[PDB]
Every structure is written in C-alpha cells, then in structure tokens.
Write a protein that binds this ligand. Structure first.
Ligand SMILES: OC[C@H]1O[C@H](O[C@@H]2[C@H](O)[C@@H](OC[C@H]3O[C@H](O)[C@@H](O)[C@@H](O[C@H]4O[C@H](CO)[C@@H](O)[C@H](O)[C@@H]4O)[C@@H]3O)O[C@H](CO)[C@H]2O)[C@@H](O)[C@@H](O)[C@@H]1O
Ligand SMILES: OC[C@H]1O[C@H](O[C@@H]2[C@H](O)[C@@H](OC[C@H]3O[C@H](O)[C@@H](O)[C@@H](O[C@H]4O[C@H](CO)[C@@H](O)[C@H](O)[C@@H]4O)[C@@H]3O)O[C@H](CO)[C@H]2O)[C@@H](O)[C@@H](O)[C@@H]1O
Ligand SMILES: OC[C@H]1O[C@H](OC[C@H]2O[C@H](O)[C@@H](O)[C@@H](O[C@H]3O[C@H](CO)[C@@H](O)[C@H](O)[C@@H]3O)[C@@H]2O)[C@@H](O)[C@@H](O)[C@@H]1O
Ligand SMILES: OC[C@H]1O[C@H](OC[C@H]2O[C@H](O)[C@@H](O)[C@@H](O[C@H]3O[C@H](CO)[C@@H](O)[C@H](O)[C@@H]3O)[C@@H]2O)[C@@H](O)[C@@H](O)[C@@H]1O
Lengths: 149, 149, 149, 149
C-alpha cells in the first residue's frame, strides 16, 4: 500500500463507486458529455510510459473528447465543474453536469456539459493529480482525485 | 526546503498575502466573524506540542470563536465556506464571507459569517490539513491549505 | 511526474543503470544468485492488482528464487546485503554479492549470495518501498529503492 | 497526526530513547565527539525560520562542533557513520562511534569520532532529511532520520 492524499468526492451519492488508483501522472483524458458528463476514462503515465486506465463508459449518445496533455511539461493546474440533478434522469440524485480542466501552460479544456447547479473548484498550488476516484451509474455521478508531489 | 501538497486560494486577490506553513497538525483555530470573516489565527501541532501560528487579525469588531479540536484523535475532514464581493468596503475584490469546518468525529463548526456568494468545498477523503495559506487586508480576503499524510 | 523519496544507490559504479519506477507496493521478487546476486526482477502491486516489472536478468547459471509476499498484510521491513568486487569477474568494480529481505511478519528471505565485503542496511520504521532502482551489467551491480507512505 | 517516512535505527538498543520530530529542514547540527559520538543537537528550519531542536547532550568531555549548513540551498545528501560496542563503558551494547555528513554542495563534515565497528551509509538520491530519531544514554547510542520531499 502506498496511498495518496485523496481529496474529493464531488457530486451524487448514487451510481456505482469506483477508483482508478494512483499512478505517476496524467497523460490524457477521454469523456463523453452533452447536458452533463457521461463517460469518463483516462490515460495515466506510469514511469514515463502510458498506461490505459479502467474504463467508465456511458451508453448515452454523448459527445466524445480526447484531452491530449503536453505531458510531462504540462499537467493539470485545476479541476472545476458543476454538479446537480438531471432533467433527463429517472433518479433525482445529482451528477457531474459540467467539468473543466485547466493546465499549467494556460491551456483550458471545456467546460464540458452544463455549467448548472453547485460549482466546485480545486485550485492546486503545489502537487499533481495522479489519480481519479468517482461514481458512474448511467453517467458520471461523482468524481474526486488523488495527489502527490 | 521540504514542501507540501498545497491546494487552495479560495477567495479574492486583494488584501495582503501570507502563508503560515506546514506543521504536524491542527490543534485549534481562532477567528472573528460577522457578515464576513475577519481575524483568523490557529494553533498547529508540532510533533506533539502546541505551536502558536502567526496572527492574521482584523481590526473590525467581529464576534470571536475558539475552535478547539480534540487532537490528535480529531482533525478536519472538510472545509466549506463562501466568497465574493462585499458592501461596507471600498475595495470591490472578493473575500471569505463564511467558513464551515466539519470534523472526522462528526462535529461541525459554523457556518461562520454570511453565506453570501460562491460556495467552495474541500472534502478530504484521505489526508490531513497541516497549514494555512491565505490573504488578509482589513479582514480575511482568501484562504488556502497545506496537506500531507 | 509524482516522485518518491529515493534513497539508495548501493554497490558498483559499473554495469548499466536502470530504474523500475515507483508503484503501489511489493508483491513478489525474483532473482538469481550464487556467489553474488545475478538476475533481479520484481512483481509490484499496482492498486490491488499485480504488475510485472521490467526484467533485469543475468545469463549466469545462478540459483533462481521467487519471494512470495503475503501482500498486502506483509511488506518489506528492511533490506540488507553486501557489496564488493568479484573473483569471477573481469572488471574490478564492486557488485551486489548478497541481499537479505526482511518482512514485517518476521519472515526473512536470504541472505542470498555471499555475505562478503561492505555491509549495507536500510531499516524502515515508517513507509514502504514501492520501487527499485539499480545497475546490472552481467549481474546486479548496484541497487536502491523508492518509498512512500 | 501527519507522519513521515522514517528510515533508521542505526546503532545500539541501549541508552534512553528520543525523537526530535519532523520539521521543514535542517539548518545546523551541533555535536561532541572523541572516540565516539556523544552530544547531538540540531537546529531545524520551520517554514523559513530557525527552530532549536531538543537537546541530546552527553556529560563526557568531547570536542564540540557546529555544522552550519548553507540552507536552503544546501542540505544533506548522505549520512555515513560507525556503530559497535565500546570500551570505557560498563554497558556492552553498541553505539554511534562515528558520523559523516556529505552535502549536495559537495562539502563533507567529519568523519567525527573513531571509525570503529560496522559502517552504515544512507545515500539520498531524491529527498530531504527533516528529522532525527535516536537513543542517548551517557552518550549517543543510536540515530535514525525522518524524510520527506
Ligand atoms: O425515481 C423513481 C424511482 O427511481 C428508481 O427506480 C428505477 C426507475 O424506475 C428506472 O430507472 C431507470 C434509469 O433511469 C435513468 O436512466 C437513470 O435515473 C438511471 O439511474 C442510474 O444512473 C444515475 C446516473 O448515472 C445514477 O444516479 C443512478 O443511481 C443509476 O446508476 C436509472 O437506472 O428503472 C429502474 C429499474 O431497475 C428502477 O430501479 C428507484 O429509486 C425508485 O425507488 C424510485 O421510485
Ligand atoms: O579488467 C580488464 C579490462 O576490463 C575491461 O575490458 C573488458 C574485458 O577485457 C572483457 O570483459 C568481459 C566481461 O567479463 C566479466 O564477465 C565481467 O567483468 C563483465 O563486466 C560486466 O559486468 C559487470 C557486473 O555486472 C559490470 O561491473 C561491468 O561494468 C560489465 O557490465 C565483462 O564485460 O571483455 C570486454 C569486451 O568488450 C572488455 O570490455 C576494460 O575495463 C579494460 O579497460 C580493462 O583493462
Ligand atoms: O487609503 C487607501 C484607501 O483608503 C480607503 O479604502 C479603505 C478601507 O476601506 C475598506 O475597509 C476596504 O476596502 C479596505 O481594503 C483593504 O482590505 C481588503 C480586504 O481585507 C483588501 O481587499 C484591500 O486590498 C485592503 O487591504 C480599505 O483599506 C479608501 O479611501 C480608498 O479609496 C483608498 O484607496
Ligand atoms: O548505576 C547503574 C550502573 O552504574 C554503572 O554503569 C555506569 C555508566 O557506565 C558507562 O559510562 C556506561 O555503561 C553508562 O551507560 C549508559 O549509557 C550508555 C550509552 O549512552 C547506554 O547504553 C546505557 O543504557 C546507559 O544509558 C553507565 O551509566 C555500573 O556500576 C553499572 O554496573 C550499573 O548498572
């Protein structure tokens, strides 16, 4: 067991809990969205070489986006997004409606989905997100992160 | 020069800047609140013994509070709070209007201040807050935190 | 880039430098030996599941040994071994003549090879070795480790 | 209660135990040596400012030394030293007979004491010493260290 500082758990209490674990760095991020984030997958770096992380896909006919990071010079500086219930869902729980990834080279990805509901921001001054935790039912219910130096 | 994962900078870019540093843990948090957050000091733990952190006191006549944590068994599990502009102030920049400290033993401190503006939540899953960064002018502009395992 | 505390670099200045990188934990260790450690490979744990690490095999007709750890309850508590030049080598540089892995459940592996030359001991009171660094020419020239909590 | 990777316990099980703790860095190390190591104090850095660490002084009449590190640019890169029994002592347990501090700027302190017994080397590749654990009776029995990034 190493263990990373894990802050997070942003969004719904529903869906199905999952945890990618901690790696070496973020190399790329995939995720479908529409009026909210559906699928979400990530490609971590593990000691200089790419490592395909576990998939958290969503049947929803959402929009796919590959976020290619200029790793390792570039890495996330902050993660933001919105959470809230969904018109289109049977369940009245909340979910990741939006998601915005900002990098240290001033690049910005998204916002994806809808910027509706309670906002959440994780400004990182020192350290790197090295892991993603979350819950996905029919779509990204919630999400959190792992960090190290 | 040891460093620590430092997430943060919730609040405005105004006031004068500061950073308490990284310690062993949090033993107690003192602060003054009214329609916003002013004074904010804290007593960190330094290898078992109490270390009085630098002062960040606001002239304003707010109501004071002592947050005595049942260290080392208890320690913050979360930090909520609000930020945004504010009347009664010549400056238009945003500041901490309210704070909320949840702890691992299920005890809740606050909300302190007016819950006005944009909410922010730092939910710690695994890890400890060990320091406070921030900005204070006439009162508490912003706030950030140092973390470690 | 995460990065782990890396202490080490025990043994010869020769051979060919290599680095396994940092993982999640030690799950098993393979290595050939005779009058010194020849081959050395390791199976790390990466978020609950086994991950075959890079191979550092040696042509030498040495003795093979698989060190199966009762992971995750069990993990190395200390690493010791000897370094020194080798009768059987052309080069007059030093190498990992011996190697002794001790676990937290009081189990002991080895010593492997020869307990000759300058001894080296890494007693760990808090933390886990999560990575191996080293140099291997015709046999394990040197070795070090990565650590986290 | 923050913790730190703590490797160590080089020396004997005798004398009375101690542990300075984890700080921000090492600024200066004081100590007394003759045919062995006696007194051993240290001034750690605490977020930019000097923090005088607890005293571990030995009655014996040894020669004293101030190890003034050119912090924060300079910090130890290695710790060598010897341990083993010792004459002039009723107790048969082992103790630190000598110490050697190498630094990142290529400066070397010591060897201090008699180089008698079993050598030990803590070569830091990546990381910082931030604390000292150990045991001291009439003089310095053993020594260990806290580390962090
Ligand atoms: O709200 C009424 C009713 O809801 C639950 O019963 C369900 C419901 O009848 C129906 O749900 C079908 C799916 O409808 C939408 O696609 C989603 O709400 C989906 O929920 C999943 O995804 C979201 C987001 O990822 C997540 O928050 C959820 O936890 C799920 O992972 C629904 O599954 O049909 C199913 C058939 O089994 C019913 O279970 C119950 O809560 C019920 O008590 C309630 O009255
Ligand atoms: O010492 C005399 C001579 O040595 C070097 O020349 C070599 C030498 O003539 C011969 O070496 C063959 C191999 O012999 C043994 O198997 C080993 O010493 C091996 O060395 C490798 O493994 C060890 C341990 O893993 C490691 O320390 C070494 O760095 C190597 O990885 C030898 O390779 O033939 C080769 C043919 O290329 C010669 O290079 C030179 O140092 C020479 O200056 C010296 O006079
Ligand atoms: O003389 C300079 C300044 O004086 C008068 O503004 C005065 C104070 O008015 C309010 O109380 C605040 O705006 C305060 O601002 C301080 O605190 C803020 C939060 O703590 C911070 O954002 C500010 O940077 C500052 O530290 C003012 O000090 C007024 O006449 C101004 O026009 C004039 O510039
Ligand atoms: O009264 C107890 C003890 O007294 C006499 O031993 C005395 C001192 O002798 C030597 O100086 C040392 O052995 C010293 O031992 C202390 O320091 C050691 C290293 O610092 C440590 O290992 C020991 O645990 C102890 O702290 C002794 O104090 C002698 O008459 C003994 O027979 C008698 O037990």
């Amino acid at each position: 067991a190493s263990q990373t500082i894990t802050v997070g758990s942003w969004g719904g209490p529903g869906g199905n809990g999952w945890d990618d674990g901690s790696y070496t760095g973020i190399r790329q991020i995939e995720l479908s969205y529409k009026e909210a984030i559906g699928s979400f997958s990530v490609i971590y770096d593990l000691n200089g070489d790419p490592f395909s992380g576990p998939k958290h896909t969503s049947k929803l006919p959402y929009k796919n986006v590959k976020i290619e990071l200029k790793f390792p010079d570039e890495f996330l500086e902050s993660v933001s997004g919105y959470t809230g219930p969904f018109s289109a869902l049977a369940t009245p729980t909340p979910v990741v409606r939006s998601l915005t990834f900002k990098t240290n080279k001033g690049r910005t990805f998204g916002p994806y989905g809808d910027e509706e509901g309670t906002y959440f921001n994780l400004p990182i001054e020192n350290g790197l997100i090295v892991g993603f935790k979350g819950r996905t039912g029919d779509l990204l219910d919630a999400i959190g992160i792992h960090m190290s130096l």
